[PDB]
Design a protein around this motif. Structure first.
Motif, PDB file in Angstrom:
ATOM      1  N   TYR A  95     -13.049  -0.242   9.246  1.00  0.00           N
ATOM      2  CA  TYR A  95     -13.313   0.356   7.934  1.00  0.00           C
ATOM      3  C   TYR A  95     -14.767   0.149   7.479  1.00  0.00           C
ATOM      4  CZ  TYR A  95      -8.164   0.397   8.006  1.00  0.00           C
ATOM      5  OH  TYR A  95      -6.843   0.591   8.366  1.00  0.00           O
TER       6      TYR A  95
ATOM      7  N   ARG B 249       4.560   0.168   7.283  1.00  0.00           N
ATOM      8  CA  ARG B 249       4.272  -1.142   7.849  1.00  0.00           C
ATOM      9  C   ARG B 249       5.215  -2.119   7.148  1.00  0.00           C
ATOM     10  NH1 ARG B 249      -1.123  -1.494   7.135  1.00  0.00           N
ATOM     11  NH2 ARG B 249      -1.135  -2.691   5.180  1.00  0.00           N
TER      12      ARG B 249
ATOM     13  N   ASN C 212       0.470   6.467 -13.387  1.00  0.00           N
ATOM     14  CA  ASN C 212      -0.087   5.935 -12.141  1.00  0.00           C
ATOM     15  C   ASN C 212      -1.392   5.176 -12.329  1.00  0.00           C
ATOM     16  OD1 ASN C 212       2.019   7.579 -10.980  1.00  0.00           O
ATOM     17  ND2 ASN C 212       0.830   7.587  -9.072  1.00  0.00           N
TER      18      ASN C 212
ATOM     19  N   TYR D 261      10.862   6.506   2.641  1.00  0.00           N
ATOM     20  CA  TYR D 261      10.008   5.976   3.718  1.00  0.00           C
ATOM     21  C   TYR D 261      10.530   6.156   5.140  1.00  0.00           C
ATOM     22  CZ  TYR D 261       7.467   4.165  -0.288  1.00  0.00           C
ATOM     23  OH  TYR D 261       6.789   4.060  -1.490  1.00  0.00           O
TER      24      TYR D 261
ATOM     25  N   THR E  44      -5.602   7.864   1.050  1.00  0.00           N
ATOM     26  CA  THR E  44      -6.249   6.581   1.334  1.00  0.00           C
ATOM     27  C   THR E  44      -7.726   6.549   0.991  1.00  0.00           C
ATOM     28  OG1 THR E  44      -6.856   7.049   3.645  1.00  0.00           O
ATOM     29  CG2 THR E  44      -4.609   6.231   3.240  1.00  0.00           C
TER      30      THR E  44
ATOM     31  N   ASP F 116      -8.815  -0.820   3.279  1.00  0.00           N
ATOM     32  CA  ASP F 116      -7.980   0.220   2.653  1.00  0.00           C
ATOM     33  C   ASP F 116      -6.895  -0.327   1.730  1.00  0.00           C
ATOM     34  OD1 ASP F 116      -6.567  -0.738   4.937  1.00  0.00           O
ATOM     35  OD2 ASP F 116      -5.531   1.163   5.162  1.00  0.00           O
TER      36      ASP F 116
ATOM     37  N   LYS G 241      -5.146  -1.802  -1.410  1.00  0.00           N
ATOM     38  CA  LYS G 241      -5.380  -1.550  -2.831  1.00  0.00           C
ATOM     39  C   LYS G 241      -5.423  -2.836  -3.660  1.00  0.00           C
ATOM     40  CE  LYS G 241      -2.480   1.860  -2.221  1.00  0.00           C
ATOM     41  NZ  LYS G 241      -1.591   3.068  -2.280  1.00  0.00           N
TER      42      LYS G 241
ATOM     43  N   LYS H 154       5.271  13.786   0.596  1.00  0.00           N
ATOM     44  CA  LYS H 154       5.276  13.494   2.026  1.00  0.00           C
ATOM     45  C   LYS H 154       4.831  12.047   2.245  1.00  0.00           C
ATOM     46  CE  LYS H 154       2.448  14.587   6.080  1.00  0.00           C
ATOM     47  NZ  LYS H 154       1.327  15.440   6.559  1.00  0.00           N
ATOM     48  N   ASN H 155       5.631  11.289   2.989  1.00  0.00           N
ATOM     49  CA  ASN H 155       5.241   9.951   3.439  1.00  0.00           C
ATOM     50  C   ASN H 155       4.966   9.933   4.944  1.00  0.00           C
ATOM     51  OD1 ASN H 155       5.168   6.838   3.158  1.00  0.00           O
ATOM     52  ND2 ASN H 155       6.648   7.245   4.833  1.00  0.00           N
ATOM     53  N   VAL H 156       3.916   9.218   5.351  1.00  0.00           N
ATOM     54  CA  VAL H 156       3.637   9.013   6.784  1.00  0.00           C
ATOM     55  C   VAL H 156       3.780   7.544   7.179  1.00  0.00           C
ATOM     56  CG1 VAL H 156       1.915   9.249   8.627  1.00  0.00           C
ATOM     57  CG2 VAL H 156       2.093  11.009   6.826  1.00  0.00           C
TER      58      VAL H 156
ATOM     59  N   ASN I 283       0.802  -1.239   0.000  1.00  0.00           N
ATOM     60  CA  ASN I 283       0.000   0.000   0.000  1.00  0.00           C
ATOM     61  C   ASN I 283       0.823   1.271   0.000  1.00  0.00           C
ATOM     62  OD1 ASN I 283      -2.717  -1.022  -0.115  1.00  0.00           O
ATOM     63  ND2 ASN I 283      -3.350   0.553   1.375  1.00  0.00           N
ATOM     64  N   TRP I 284       2.067   1.175   0.456  1.00  0.00           N
ATOM     65  CA  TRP I 284       2.951   2.337   0.514  1.00  0.00           C
ATOM     66  C   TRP I 284       3.627   2.617  -0.816  1.00  0.00           C
ATOM     67  CZ3 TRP I 284       1.202   0.478   4.932  1.00  0.00           C
ATOM     68  CH2 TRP I 284       1.122   1.323   6.049  1.00  0.00           C
ATOM     69  N   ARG I 285       3.562   1.652  -1.735  1.00  0.00           N
ATOM     70  CA  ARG I 285       4.327   1.688  -2.984  1.00  0.00           C
ATOM     71  C   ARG I 285       3.665   2.499  -4.071  1.00  0.00           C
ATOM     72  NH1 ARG I 285       8.408  -2.090  -2.759  1.00  0.00           N
ATOM     73  NH2 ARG I 285       8.090  -3.610  -1.035  1.00  0.00           N
ATOM     74  N   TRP I 286       4.459   2.853  -5.067  1.00  0.00           N
ATOM     75  CA  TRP I 286       3.963   3.412  -6.299  1.00  0.00           C
ATOM     76  C   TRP I 286       3.324   2.287  -7.124  1.00  0.00           C
ATOM     77  CZ3 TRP I 286       7.755   4.545 -10.868  1.00  0.00           C
ATOM     78  CH2 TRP I 286       7.070   5.222 -11.903  1.00  0.00           C
TER      79      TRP I 286
HETATM   80  O1  LIG Z   1       1.547   6.923  -5.314  1.00  0.00           O
HETATM   81  C1  LIG Z   1       2.284   6.490  -4.158  1.00  0.00           C
HETATM   82  C2  LIG Z   1       1.564   6.858  -2.859  1.00  0.00           C
HETATM   83  O2  LIG Z   1       0.296   6.189  -2.750  1.00  0.00           O
HETATM   84  C3  LIG Z   1       2.432   6.491  -1.654  1.00  0.00           C
HETATM   85  O3  LIG Z   1       1.780   7.020  -0.615  1.00  0.00           O
HETATM   86  C4  LIG Z   1       1.735   6.266   0.604  1.00  0.00           C
HETATM   87  C5  LIG Z   1       0.415   5.487   0.678  1.00  0.00           C
HETATM   88  O4  LIG Z   1       0.343   4.783   1.923  1.00  0.00           O
HETATM   89  C6  LIG Z   1       0.338   5.685   3.038  1.00  0.00           C
HETATM   90  O5  LIG Z   1       0.136   5.005   4.164  1.00  0.00           O
HETATM   91  C7  LIG Z   1      -1.203   4.587   4.451  1.00  0.00           C
HETATM   92  C8  LIG Z   1      -1.324   4.678   5.974  1.00  0.00           C
HETATM   93  O6  LIG Z   1      -2.497   4.018   6.464  1.00  0.00           O
HETATM   94  C9  LIG Z   1      -2.501   2.622   6.155  1.00  0.00           C
HETATM   95  O7  LIG Z   1      -3.678   2.024   6.713  1.00  0.00           O
HETATM   96  C10 LIG Z   1      -2.552   2.449   4.638  1.00  0.00           C
HETATM   97  O8  LIG Z   1      -2.547   1.047   4.320  1.00  0.00           O
HETATM   98  C11 LIG Z   1      -1.431   3.173   3.900  1.00  0.00           C
HETATM   99  O9  LIG Z   1      -1.807   3.226   2.504  1.00  0.00           O
HETATM  100  C12 LIG Z   1       1.640   6.469   3.109  1.00  0.00           C
HETATM  101  O10 LIG Z   1       1.545   7.370   4.223  1.00  0.00           O
HETATM  102  C13 LIG Z   1       1.841   7.222   1.793  1.00  0.00           C
HETATM  103  O11 LIG Z   1       3.120   7.864   1.739  1.00  0.00           O
HETATM  104  O12 LIG Z   1       3.756   7.047  -1.735  1.00  0.00           O
HETATM  105  C14 LIG Z   1       4.469   6.686  -2.929  1.00  0.00           C
HETATM  106  C15 LIG Z   1       3.670   7.132  -4.156  1.00  0.00           C
HETATM  107  O13 LIG Z   1       4.361   6.774  -5.356  1.00  0.00           O
END
Ligand SMILES: O[C@@H]1[C@@H](O)[C@H](O[C@@H]2CO[C@@H](O[C@@H]3CO[C@@H](O)[C@H](O)[C@H]3O)[C@H](O)[C@H]2O)OC[C@H]1O
Ligand SMILES: O[C@@H]1[C@@H](O)[C@H](O[C@@H]2CO[C@@H](O[C@@H]3CO[C@@H](O)[C@H](O)[C@H]3O)[C@H](O)[C@H]2O)OC[C@H]1O
Ligand code: NAG
Ligand code: NAG
Ligand code: CO
Ligand code: CO
Ligand code: CO
Lengths: 434, 434
Positions: A247, A107, A49, A82, A201, A179, A181, A102-104, A37-40
């Motif tokens: 959710y 996991r 995209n 990350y 999200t 949540d 993808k 910005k990344n948050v 989920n964090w990936r592109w």
């Molecule tokens: O396009 C890509 C972006 O989608 C990516 O963004 C990250 C998406 O995940 C985020 O974390 C969420 C936190 O809550 C969890 O429950 C979810 O499963 C996660 O999706 C994260 O904070 C974003 O940075 O970054 C890279 C882009 O290429």
């Protein structure tokens, strides 16, 4: 989804100790991988995209199957994108990392090889780790836990997922998260609703359920230990609000227990056990060791070590329950005194034992909470309750704390460090590392 | 009985540590007293014996009440007569001590004051001690255990006993022993039968029953951990063969369980865990630490430390039971696989929990076995069974071992040393002594 290689995937290495009943420990070499989920996520044939912000490409992703065929996950720059770094047996995760975007948080899963997750059989064994929570304020959760994921991340069951564990596919937990993808080698674009409060999200028509052992959900203020049973032990797709969990409309309308039988010493009345500074038994400004033992009865035992001093989980008295072991009597008394029936409806510790008897994957994460601001962990919850409601107060944080945009702006340099992971038979992990 | 002072009574001092959940331990000062049966019993008005060899004076002791009125217990020369010495937190007991007469072993109680026993509430707590068993060969038992005795040794209930705890009165255990010379402030001369094989002992018409926690019954070859429930938790007189136990015709015709739910790692199949030399996990030629934890569920946990290395009780598999915790499932499986119904007939761990929830007195002893040569601990028992009988083999000693006259002649300098007693909440006793 498939995997693409516009960005290389190098899993940060991480070592841990496997201990034996005979009194020695031997080093193991694994690595960590970030969840998909964090990936592109982009088109297989270009850099376009498939998912951007919190919406899907309507052309690349008109339905779940077409989306998975058209789209791939790419590699992660662990440190620069990350905020994830390792050194030997230590792993650090930064809260907010600014790059091009910005990344948050993150996991992460512990791997056995570049393409498979490490599985642990918890029953009869104990898990020890060190943690520094000093840089975790109200509203944050540095979590270490186990889930009943497939070692391949779902590839054998769902051949339209060719990315696998190498790209962090296959997640599930007791919230039956919607949540995600990709679930079961299909996208989750059907039924997708963007989050009202999170630019990154949304919630889809499918969720991914499985048993969850929350060894550690914590910040500098509060910590909780929580088993969560499900009626299907391992990973299983769920449909819509039938998923239950965080959710969904109806929290309790699914196969998993989203509440669990939680043990938070503060919630149970010991408000002096764990917190910042020398006025607490465990000082959260300093590193501490946390050991969790899974006896074959299905009960869970816990002790802590800080500066060479050992503390069992503090005693709690709740209804007719008295002790420090998380057992059937505790969980039943908790339901009676604090309310709820989810844990027992889902089979309690007996059902949970089916998960710990099998393999589970190790997860380490850092997150803030867009649904409930982490108040269930470190504040009074629900926020209209007072201390006169049994179990309402879980920590000293204000009921106003933990707004994600606020903590992201004020505490971007928050972080968690997990280190010195040791695993083996009960009684074995305090012996010298090898 | 009353007390006389032809020989002074000075209890050897002994310290021990009381530990707290907050992580510190503080020294306590007690002492040890020898059981009344080892003492000289004489007329109140002269040095004429009331008991000599294994017979009573027919004139001083024509019945139980007259005997108690006419007779007193006197003081003990701990070192020169009984081979009992202490130094700080250490206690040593020699097997055979030659003075004017030959003495064999001792049974000792930890005192709170010169006139009262120390009581320990085991439930929710743990007990740690160090032991040197290197000088204990086949047929010997250096024992550390707890029994539900009155703190005054019976004086408040039986005013014809004025000697009390100061003179080691009031013993009881799960064998409902009938060899005691005084029970409930009366002699035990009525129904007295001298032992056929022991010049110093006999069996009377009364016995003394109570719950017994055998933390440690052991020599250099074998060790066992055994709770024994009774239907009356505390001290209670019994009549004749209705007593049950080792000293009766029918072992099982009484209020106590003389067998117990025993855990001997060798008996359970791990023949490599405990024995002399470097071929065993715990080397019995060297001092070892033994820790026993009484969780509130009523189950018992155990670990050992030697040379800084920690070992949980070894795992055992027996019928459907698998684990290292002595719990309901273990005890039920043991009965099913090895045989017997005594433990469960007497209420099992639930009934036993009533004893550990109350006060128990600490006993340390060294003995040989005039009834069964200690074969039940360290050999094959019964002796006609083979290794194909489940649970028959309890240790490597010959079925010919442990004849009391033989081991007394061959191994008179055998001894046991118990030291570094620590008691407090579960998880607390490994912290520094104060
Ligand atoms: O396009 C890509 C972006 O989608 C990516 O963004 C990250 C998406 O995940 C985020 O974390 C969420 C936190 O809550 C969890 O429950 C979810 O499963 C996660 O999706 C994260 O904070 C974003 O940075 O970054 C890279 C882009 O290429
Ligand atoms: O007259 C006195 C003797 O009786 C005394 O002899 C001791 C008597 O107790 C013996 O130990 C027994 C061992 O078995 C236990 O079950 C019994 O309860 C004990 O009685 C001990 O071995 C003898 O020395 O010695 C002093 C004399 O004045
Ligand atoms: C005996 O117990 C020790 C300590 O748990 C263990 O290491 C060993 O493998 C066991 N051996 C057998 C034969 O069960
Ligand atoms: C909290 O737990 C610690 C560790 O067991 C204990 O020492 C302390 O007394 C407890 N305090 C309260 C208020 O329960
Ligand atoms: Co569907
Ligand atoms: Co237990
Ligand atoms: Co009578």
């Amino acid at each position: 989804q498939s995997a693409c290689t516009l960005q290389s995937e190098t899993h940060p290495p991480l070592t841990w100790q496997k201990c034996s009943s005979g009194g020695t420990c031997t080093q193991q070499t694994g690595s960590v991988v970030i969840d998909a989920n964090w990936r592109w996520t982009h088109a297989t044939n270009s850099s376009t995209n498939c998912y951007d912000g919190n919406t899907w490409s309507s052309t690349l992703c008109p339905d779940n199957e077409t989306c998975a065929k058209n789209c791939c996950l790419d590699g992660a720059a662990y440190a620069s994108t990350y905020g994830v770094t390792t050194s030997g047996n230590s792993l650090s995760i930064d809260f907010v990392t600014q790059s091009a975007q910005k990344n948050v948080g993150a996991r992460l899963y512990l791997m056995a090889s570049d393409t498979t997750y490490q599985e642990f059989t918890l029953l009869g064994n104990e898990f020890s780790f060190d943690v520094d929570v000093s840089q975790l304020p109200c509203g944050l959760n540095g979590a270490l836990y186990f889930v009943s994921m497939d070692a391949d991340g779902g590839v054998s069951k769902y051949p339209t997922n060719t990315a696998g564990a190498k790209y962090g596919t296959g997640y599930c937990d007791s919230q039956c998260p919607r949540d995600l993808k990709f679930i079961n080698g299909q996208a989750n674009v059907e039924g997708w609703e963007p989050s009202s409060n999170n630019a990154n999200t949304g919630i889809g028509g499918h969720g991914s359920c499985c048993s969850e052992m929350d060894i550690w959900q914590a910040n500098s203020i509060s910590e909780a230990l929580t088993p969560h049973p499900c009626t299907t032990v391992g990973q299983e797709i769920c449909e819509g609000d039938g998923c239950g969990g965080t959710y969904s409309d109806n929290r309790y309308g699914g196969t998993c227990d989203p509440d669990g039988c939680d043990w938070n010493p503060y919630r149970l009345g010991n408000t002096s056990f764990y917190g910042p500074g020398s006025s607490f038994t465990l000082d959260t400004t300093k590193k501490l060791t946390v050991v969790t033992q899974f006896e074959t009865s299905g009960a869970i035992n816990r002790y802590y070590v800080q500066n060479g001093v050992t503390f069992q989980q503090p005693n709690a008295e709740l209804g007719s329950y008295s002790g420090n072991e998380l057992n059937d009597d505790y969980c039943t008394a908790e339901e009676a005194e604090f309310g709820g029936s989810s844990f027992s409806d889902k089979g309690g510790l007996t059902q949970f034992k089916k998960a710990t008897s099998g393999g589970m994957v190790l997860v380490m994460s850092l997150w803030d909470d867009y649904y409930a601001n982490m108040l269930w962990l470190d504040s009074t919850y629900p926020t209209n309750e007072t201390s006169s409601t049994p179990g309402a107060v879980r920590g000293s944080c204000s009921t106003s704390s933990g707004v994600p945009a606020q903590v992201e702006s004020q505490s971007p340099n928050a972080k968690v460090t997990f280190s010195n992971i040791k695993f083996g038979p009960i009684g074995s992990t305090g012996n010298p590392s090898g």
